[PDB]
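Support case: user asked for a sample of complex input and structure output to validate their parser. Sending the pair below.
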Amino acid sequence: SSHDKMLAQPLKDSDVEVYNIIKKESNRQRVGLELIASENFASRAVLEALGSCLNNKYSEGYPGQRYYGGTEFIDELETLCQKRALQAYKLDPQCWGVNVQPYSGSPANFAVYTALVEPHGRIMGLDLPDGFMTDKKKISATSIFFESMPYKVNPDTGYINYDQLEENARLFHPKLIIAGTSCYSRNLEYARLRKIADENGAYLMADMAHISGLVAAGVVPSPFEHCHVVTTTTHKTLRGCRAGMIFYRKGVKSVDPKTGKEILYNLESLINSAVFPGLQGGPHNHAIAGVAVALKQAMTLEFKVYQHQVVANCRALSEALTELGYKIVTGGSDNHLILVDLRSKGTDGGRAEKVLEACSIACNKNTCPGDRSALRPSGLRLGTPALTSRGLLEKDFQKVAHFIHRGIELTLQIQSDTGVRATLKEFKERLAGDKYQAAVQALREEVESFASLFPLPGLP
Amino acid sequence: SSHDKMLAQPLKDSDVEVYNIIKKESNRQRVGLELIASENFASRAVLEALGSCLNNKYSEGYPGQRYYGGTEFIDELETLCQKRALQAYKLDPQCWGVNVQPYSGSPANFAVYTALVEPHGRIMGLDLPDGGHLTHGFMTDKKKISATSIFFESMPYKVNPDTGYINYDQLEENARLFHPKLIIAGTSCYSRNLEYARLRKIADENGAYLMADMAHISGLVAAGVVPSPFEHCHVVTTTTHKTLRGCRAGMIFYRKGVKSVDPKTGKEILYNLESLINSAVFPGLQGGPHNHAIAGVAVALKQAMTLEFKVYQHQVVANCRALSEALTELGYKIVTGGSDNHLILVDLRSKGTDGGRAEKVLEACSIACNKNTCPGDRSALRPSGLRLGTPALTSRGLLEKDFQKVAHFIHRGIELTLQIQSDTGVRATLKEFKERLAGDKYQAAVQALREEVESFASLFPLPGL
Amino acid sequence: SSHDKMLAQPLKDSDVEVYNIIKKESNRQRVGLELIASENFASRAVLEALGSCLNNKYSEGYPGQRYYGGTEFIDELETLCQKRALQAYKLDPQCWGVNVQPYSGSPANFAVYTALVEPHGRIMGLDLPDGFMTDKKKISATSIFFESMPYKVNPDTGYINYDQLEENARLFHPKLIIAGTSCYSRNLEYARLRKIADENGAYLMADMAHISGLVAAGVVPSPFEHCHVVTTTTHKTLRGCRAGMIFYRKGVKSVDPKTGKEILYNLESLINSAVFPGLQGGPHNHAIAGVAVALKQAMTLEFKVYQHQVVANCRALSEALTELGYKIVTGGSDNHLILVDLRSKGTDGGRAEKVLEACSIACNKNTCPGDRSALRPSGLRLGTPALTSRGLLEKDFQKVAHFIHRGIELTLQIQSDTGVRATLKEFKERLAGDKYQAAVQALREEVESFASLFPLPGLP
Amino acid sequence: SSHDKMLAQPLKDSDVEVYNIIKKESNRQRVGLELIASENFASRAVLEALGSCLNNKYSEGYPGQRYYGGTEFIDELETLCQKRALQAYKLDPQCWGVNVQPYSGSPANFAVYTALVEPHGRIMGLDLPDGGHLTHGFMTDKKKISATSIFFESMPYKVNPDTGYINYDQLEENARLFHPKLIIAGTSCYSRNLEYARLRKIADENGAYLMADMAHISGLVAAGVVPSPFEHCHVVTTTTHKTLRGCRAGMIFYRKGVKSVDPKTGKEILYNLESLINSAVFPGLQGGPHNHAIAGVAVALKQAMTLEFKVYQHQVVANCRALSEALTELGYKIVTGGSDNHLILVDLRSKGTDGGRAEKVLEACSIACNKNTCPGDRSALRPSGLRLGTPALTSRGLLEKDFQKVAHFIHRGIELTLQIQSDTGVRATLKEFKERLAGDKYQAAVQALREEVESFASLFPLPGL
């Protein structure tokens, strides 16, 4: 019965190519060390929920205002998901509302923009290379469909120039202030941004994606106390699937003493109209189920213990890097991400990242505060949200730092052999050169011996 | 301690609520009759590929222009997926390019819009009550609803209410006055084929691009039973589920090679849609692609290239024709006479009722249906037609005699609708009708009907696991 | 000293160049036959009003809401002007308002566009070649700042296709539909356009610039019966200065059946804000005084007698031209214009009109349905009211008909001698032939001796 | 018969109402004292040229590319006018071009905007409450008022509230963040000179154009007493009256010739602003130009090229310095310390009052002035400064002692205003101030002051007629 078995044949028997590809990817992820702030591993429950039968049911609409029938279970599931989302951050249901229909973070941001900014409006957000539009063309859709004037961080101290921000806000008259960032270890002053938005009558939007889990454990002050709209995601902190969440205020905005009447919020209806049928159509029920499972798993004491272990291991890694003689800029860090400058060592960030990738070591490259050169980014970024989930410890992070030191010594040897005056092309030519490849091979094997010890969460 | 079990505990033991919800949903879908056109059941291979470790790896960028390291396996997988996509439609790789980065159909449509329309431009697509989609342009005189109508200027063309076919003459006359930049060829409720040759001629006369939307007929194009629009259209946006039995994703096919030749100088002009689409998709709108979705699309495309898929599509169209003839045998008014696809539109005005009441009554007896307006209706909030789809049941093993039995069941349901409407009068409202559905008078009849249809549905298996 | 003379010396003593230029222009205008429909001759009263001391006063704003002090006289003058404007068309002041601040017709159109179209909106109006935007670029500012698609008349008969207009407007959803014409001299069904606007909830715009004074004499049905906003100029019919007027509806728009309430018109405030301080600044008081004098002179029986003489002379000229074998197209026209065709003779309108300008006869080409090319026009439009303002009678119009017949004969002779396949520059060179120069000089002497008998209105 | 009596009747016999209105206006202008900066009396030659028969002739089009016929005289007049305009400012015809077709300053500004800014672009002009003009961009948080703010995106820069000079540093820092396409250099209530070199450097660093507006100094640049901005600016729009003694019109000067050369290929780039400006003026916004206005501005430009004009401008600046020193001696605070142009701004916060009431009190005694906010005022509804213009009275033949007498009269008026304000209290509203002004107690004093100033002003003639 091959005709009936076609819909029931396993993946190993149906397509061996993708099966071998997935097996090789799992083998690489198991024996390869990962040091990336955005990299993590999801639990098995969310993986089982993604492969559920909810991928077939079409559920356009909202509970009580659906378009199709037989959506009682879907409505109950989404209600449970939104209740768990509201309870995870300890928010009053009468004043806060959550939406999980957007597919990811960028669609959620675009929906919020179409709902609030009234395209061709004015936005004020943080600059891209400081943690986006050009004079010749516009790359990001936010600059294409909307007008934005970014504010620059102070190049001397490294903090937001609040006086210049207020001046540019009162001179530009924006409609929404973006209180979000990608590379900023210091905590933002949400109260000052809130009072600025109240003085200018604009809204405040925060982006707590990269810290979505850090706020869950109460390690970072919650931005829900001042910001009106709070957009975030579910991965890179919560070990969940790829989805987006939007938090908006509900209730009375401010009572008007001129007429004695009160004004109610209107963000809920605008957002609900912007998500559907504005941009997206049928939501992903499996994604909502995975998000609900991740949110329920995050509301346990084990999540707080894991976050404490994360911050402790980050502090231990910073201390180990400082002990060996490395210069950690910006006075360490106040979050999980770690930024180090290897300019004084005599090695470039991109070359070091390439040599680390050659020996099964992962990292990230980004510019440093006060951009001085776009061709030589020396802001090598480190993070361990996934190694802590696997079961790494500070005594093991000492050996990880020893491996990083061996890698930087290999990079120094390569730069001394090929020459510091050599361009990037001839350097890329000598990554797999035999001259020292055996040494590089050594830098691989021991690393593998360190990777096969710890297990890999997921499906067996 | 408990940290090792937290990342390894099964969902049945971790969260019993969502487990019971999924079990109840599967039990409902097993004993139910699904007649929605955009409804199908994915295979086990796609479900297993979606729940792989690819959800952990971040793969922002394009092959050869990646931003991070260690992307060999992801690049190989995406290359295999795009090769299978190009081979599934028998397209020359030197003349056609495929992109699978968009998350779904609407993101792909918005990406093509921001790439080619040059926002604040002019768009002409199919009207929504005439079988169009929300992304094809929809706006009223009061305010704009769809994002395509907000960011762009859309003017949809009307369909001929007498014969039911698209009035190509009115479109040609309006193209000279409106001067559009891109013509949308996409249908959601339409039982006939489109004249892509005349649309391409009009686009060349007006100097505009052509964007086809083969969402429903996609799998049909995989079987060769429907003329492929790749012969005339420039851009082609399509989905992966619906009928192709894949995960929720979108695919964009664009032209490559020489677009035109200058007769005077002789210089060869090359296409420029590839770079624009690649820039609009990333980092224009979306960020990190879903590797699991790409793997599922690749598996579905590999499974579609078999003869079993063509046999399944032939059985789908045969059961569609059988259901159509069995329903027109009972005296039901069918628009346009027949159907050239899997979806059919049954008109209820010949029975003295509307589509909403019949859809709700079918919903009461576990019969999946959807309402839709007919060409020539005086109001959009009171639809008179019902949309039925064959492949949802055909994927389970339904036959011609079984389809005739389901047609008799829908006839009995329509008789029940007429009885309930005559019991509450002709001047009643819809709330009173819904209250009469849950009444004790018709409780026994609808209960017996639901039990009968559930016993009939329990004989066929349900794919998944 | 010299300061007492610099601001007191006449124009003849100050600058002799512009003085001689004005003298030559007046001499040319004295001996000649201006056959353009747009040209006219203003009275001496408005000429003295333009040279008044009102040019020094720099006033801004509207009466009762001025910015500077001591504007009582300007406010009284503007009130008298608007009262005379309302009384000239027999309009109820409680339902109609008039504004004279716009400088000309196109500024008034742009002001009402910024007031009622909400730029980046939708407009529906007649195109250029049927009495405007290209496929590559945009020429008019209306297509640049606003989106618009034109509706075209049927090619067989030439009347407005109202059914196709309804079918297009039902899907295009226009915000304001205009009703104007420059070469389509057939009456428009304003009731059907009003019904269309009420069905689509849009506004109706009228352009009575060509028939403005013709509405003052009651010869043409007034478009104020159905149209909401009616713009018009001040010259070419009423013999006034360069200015424009905007008429808008006032009162209750419609009754609200929900609670028995009523919706009042708000076009007044929008038009006022768009005019000032939207586009223009300080209005021209001299222009206001001139248009006020013109409106006061137009409300007399002499104006109606002049319009009757205009239409009688137009009928007589059309009959005299038809008698001489010249095929008049569309049976002439309705109000004041005639259009002779020369395609039956063989020569185009361009050669005839350039020979006419060579023999001191003022004519101009125009685009009409049938003449698919502007470089080779077949339509020669003339103008009646100028000769009537100069005092020409029926026998005088017959003499002008004999003169234009002789001119067409001379043009045909020139074309036959130079060849029908010759280019335009060959025709220009043949126009300077010895015998042709003698003939055109004789014709010029004849027409100058004919025109010297009739006086020229203006300053002594 | 009737046509000889209607079209030849004088204005006094035809319409007596407008005749009496004009007579009353002339009497008010002769007996009253005007101190507004944007006020002047045109010569009799311009008034005679305005009333010529040129109003009848239509001149739609450009010289050499006309549409109608018989325009040789109008073409020669426009050529003479543009030649006089080019020669008045000592500009090379091969490098500069002039256009006089715009009707006024605002239409010319809008034409330059729609020609160069590429609407929906970004502009940076001077703020309205900081001495700027309304056409230079002005918008609030609730809605947009100016058409420039509606069609374009404008972000104005403020003036230093401490010293009173334009903060070029803040403008330079904001130019890199806003990325403007055109920088506006213009003002209406600024008593100092502009640093056009710094603005040109900022524009070259940002790659944007520099649009100058020399309206209030249109005459000052003619006599060479103020440095000309043509050395750095590309496009300069100006008026024809205010301080030039001409009719209502506007002029636009644009650069011509080679803009820059390519260092790599060696090919020189030519300017393209001429064609864009010509297309934006006609048939972009306006239609048929005013030949009488062209003749009047030509006469004014020919009269301005004499030595009497330079002597008049020197007398204006001397009387302005004398009035400034008299106001400083009278204990009144002068903004920015002095004035380098014809206009001055006197602050009233040093005496404990505002300009709103003082303006109307001066108007009650036949003293014309205008209120304006001072740099540092927290509310635009209560302005504190008063703007005074010397060239309005200098055109009649006043001297330093005459301006000192006017300053003494203004001081007495300010004393009366302070007395009236103290009589009604500080917490009183402006309407209560108006009602208290109607009382005979102060009405007798203001009437005596009005009689005195009228008897003083009647001793001087009034140009015109």
